[PDB]
Amino acid sequence: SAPGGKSRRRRTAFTSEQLLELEKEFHCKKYLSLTERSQIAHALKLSEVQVKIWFQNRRAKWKRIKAGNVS
Template identity: 60%
Template structure:
């Protein structure tokens, strides 16, 4: 049997409640009283507790809805001018497209989230263009200054020396 000094709950022996721990269960402890049949069967019981304490499996999620092209087209068309639906609009769209209210709600929530992500990405792109544009302008100005310097130096070399 494996032992550790971490207390009544350890991964090797499984989860044991404090009421199941008996004196003499750990090395170094002595128990002058004879063990009851329950206590001698502790190792088998602790192995069973490993499985008994597992959380029950969660309910299976509903599979992902595969919208048809027509449904997506109609949902996108509506989304262009109406980002949020009233309950009556939602009922109308769901009935017209053969979808449940929950599917329409979820589609609009996901579409608003996508729009938000796209807008944030667009803002980053605009900032990048601004930075690059400023950098390009700076380089053009430096280039213009270099041309101007060369022109001045050339003119100076052509002018008569005093």
């Protein structure tokens, strides 16, 4: 077991096992509390940071619309 590739793949690497519980909340609520976000990533082999980008990228698109305009 040794590393090979080292690049920031812009597309969260999700797996079927992970998607099973990940999609669960997506079909439940679009807002996760402290005792929610920090729990899903603790239930299995995950990290709170990874579960954050998932939501960030979704809101990032909204920040491009809900802002100030010019001219």
